[PDB]
């Protein structure tokens, strides 16, 4: 259950991608967070561990992996990247759960440069419709490009 879900391909439409905030110059929008995208990436308005990139998958989906990169600024050639993040999921867009192992939030180790893809496979598939990626640590600034992997599933109700 390991199919790219549509960040890089466009199957996830722009309207399905959103964020807590975006940098005030308009050059680092949520829609720039697609994996391998050639124009900057998503950056929030402020660098903090409360900001997030949100994706509505539209259907109930088994999430099995997350890929991330940072980005290089087109304007300055400086590199920005997330070093670790949490994941927060919801089937309805209202009830949000920060993904945990037992009582500990799972902290995914992410990038150590602006260009290489780091892939985190989940230990077991996770049911969700909405995904938030919530940077906890970063280098120089938050910047993200993303892919999500998994499969559509049938709800048991
Ligand atoms: Cl590719
Ligand atoms: Cl995991
Ligand atoms: Zn690619
Ligand atoms: Zn409600
Ligand atoms: Zn896990």
Swiss-Prot record:
Disulfide bonds join 1-151. Changing residue 152 to W: Rare variant; may act as a phenotype modifier in EIEE13 patients carrying SCN8A mutations. Residues 22-41 are annotated as: Disordered. It is found in: Membrane. Residues 22-34 have a biased composition (Polar residues). Residues 1-151 form the F5/8 type C domain. It comes from the Eukaryota. Heterodimer with NRP1. Binds PLXNB1. (Microbial infection) Interacts with human cytomegalovirus proteins gL, UL128, UL130 and UL131A. High affinity receptor for semaphorins 3C, 3F, VEGF-165 and VEGF-145 isoforms of VEGF, and the PLGF-2 isoform of PGF. (Microbial infection) Acts as a receptor for human cytomegalovirus pentamer-dependent entry in epithelial and endothelial cells. Belongs to the neuropilin family. The tandem CUB domains mediate binding to semaphorin, while the tandem F5/8 domains are responsible for heparin and VEGF binding. This is Neuropilin-2. It comes from Homo sapiens.
């Amino acid at each position: 259950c390991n199919v790219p879900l549509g960040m890089e391909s466009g199957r996830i439409a722009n309207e399905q991608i959103s964020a807590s905030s975006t940098y005030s110059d308009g050059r680092w929008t949520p829609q720039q967070s697609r994996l391998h995208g050639d124009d900057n990436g998503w950056t929030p308005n402020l660098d903090s561990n409360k900001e997030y990139l949100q994706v509505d998958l539209r259907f109930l989906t088994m999430l099995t992996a997350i890929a991330t990169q940072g980005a290089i600024s087109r304007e300055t050639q400086n590199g920005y990247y997330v070093k670790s993040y949490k994941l927060e999921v919801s089937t309805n867009g209202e009830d949000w759960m920060v993904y945990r192992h037992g009582k500990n939030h799972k902290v995914f180790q992410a990038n150590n440069d602006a260009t290489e893809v780091v892939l985190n496979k989940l230990h077991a598939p996770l049911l969700t419709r909405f995904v938030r990626i919530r940077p906890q640590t970063w280098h120089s600034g938050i910047a993200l490009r993303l892919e999500l992997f998994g499969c559509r599933v049938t709800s048991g109700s």
